[PDB]
């Protein structure tokens, strides 16, 4: 797995924007430059309702939109 050996990871196309894609093999989806992702999901987070008690990734909560915040499940 070239993608992972080089220190990156595989993601579905819909989760890896064009500028972040890489040419390395190993993925049945696409190799992604994970360090260049932004937003909750880009950090392994999940957008949840504001009243869900969680460990919030606060810097990414704005990316979740209205009534939502970024939780990272550990």
């Amino acid at each position: 797995n070239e993608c992972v050996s080089k220190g990156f990871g595989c993601l579905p196309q819909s989760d890896c924007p064009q500028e972040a894609r890489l040419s390395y093999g190993g993925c049945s989806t696409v190799c992604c430059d994970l360090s260049k992702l932004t937003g909750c999901k880009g950090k392994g987070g999940e957008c949840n309702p504001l009243d869900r008690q969680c460990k919030e990734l606060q810097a990414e909560s704005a990316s979740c939109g209205k009534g939502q915040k970024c939780c990272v499940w550990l």
Binding site: N1, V4, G7, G9, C10, L11, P12, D15, G26, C27, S28, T29, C32, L34, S35, K41, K43, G44, E46, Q53, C54, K55, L57, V72, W73, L74
Partner: protein, 306 residues
């Protein structure tokens, strides 16, 4: 290109490694299959310890959650360190002569493979159940411990989905079956996750505390100090519901309610800079400090048998 203890290894390499380590260390390591994943893959368990009569045991698992790659990396590091230092450091010699360690390097194998070749941040299993087209259940919401009551989603598509029923996943049923069968010998249960640098004890499915609470808190406080000895890494600790978040159906709480009085969840490095994507260059230091913690807990358990 082959196994390394300071790189993340794909499942095929970890699987090969489990046999190798048994073959290379016949007096200290044997390997078992405790069951099979949703996709039909053998789930391996290593028994680390020297043959003896009626040995008490400590059960440790890694790889509940697919994307938490440092967790399986640590189970692997633990096995090597134990055998490397057996008959050379007095503490470890004593531990392996009087105790067995069951070490489960990856539980969620289907998920782990999926993060390697398809989607790096996958968490759940890869099962399908009737009633939903979404895939996967959170194995750490799938145990019979306040099952699906707080801190768990009923939506199959969510990351904390509890499943259609407790032990709906072959992986969690296999783990629970194994522990139930060995209950009279298993004295501690340790389950390795990442990230956030914490050591957590019951309860996560409610805000209640164990009968044991004061002792668990003191033990945690002492082992995080021991962990910090090496590289200064700071861990917090406490009961799960208030320290991390409510999370019903966890394996730590389930094991504790079976009568295993020492039951902890470890959350390894880091605190979010890399998160799940902990760089390979941090594997050694993370594993070294974590090893000190597990050793400390194991030695405590040896002096507090029940």
């Amino acid at each position: 290109t082959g196994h390394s203890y300071e790189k993340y290894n794909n499942w095929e390499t970890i699987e090969a490694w489990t046999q190798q380590v048994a073959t290379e260390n016949p007096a200290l390591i044997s390997r078992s299959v405790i069951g099979t994943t949703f996709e039909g893959r053998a789930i391996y368990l290593l028994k680390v310890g020297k043959a003896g009569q009626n040995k008490p045991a400590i059960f440790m698992d890694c790889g509940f959650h697919a994307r938490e790659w440092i967790s399986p990396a640590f189970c692997q590091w633990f096995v090597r360190e134990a055998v490397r230092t057996y008959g050379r450091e007095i503490q470890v010699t004593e531990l392996l002569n009087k105790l067995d360690f069951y070490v489960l390097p990856v539980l969620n194998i289907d998920g782990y493979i999926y993060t390697w070749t398809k989607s790096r941040f996958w968490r759940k299993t890869r099962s399908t159940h009737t009633g939903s087209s979404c895939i996967g259940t959170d194995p750490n919401r799938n145990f019979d411990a306040g099952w699906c009551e707080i801190g768990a989603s009923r939506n199959p598509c969510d990351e904390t989905y509890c499943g259609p029923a407790a032990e709906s996943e072959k992986e969690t049923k296999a783990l629970a079956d194994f522990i139930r069968n060995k209950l009279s010998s298993i004295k501690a249960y340790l389950t390795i996750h990442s990230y956030s640098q914490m050591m957590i004890y019951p309860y996560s499915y409610a805000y209640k505390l164990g009968e044991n609470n004061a002792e668990l808190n003191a033990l945690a406080k002492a082992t995080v100090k021991e962990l910090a000895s090496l590289h200064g890494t700071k861990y917090t600790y406490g009961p799960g519901a208030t320290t991390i978040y409510p999370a019903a159906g966890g394996s730590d709480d389930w094991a504790y309610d079976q009568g295993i009085r020492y039951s902890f969840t470890f959350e390894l490095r880091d605190t979010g800079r890399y998160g799940f994507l902990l760089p390979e260059s941090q594997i050694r230091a993370t594993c070294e400090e974590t090893f000190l913690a597990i050793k400390y807990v194991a030695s405590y358990v040896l002096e507090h048998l029940y």
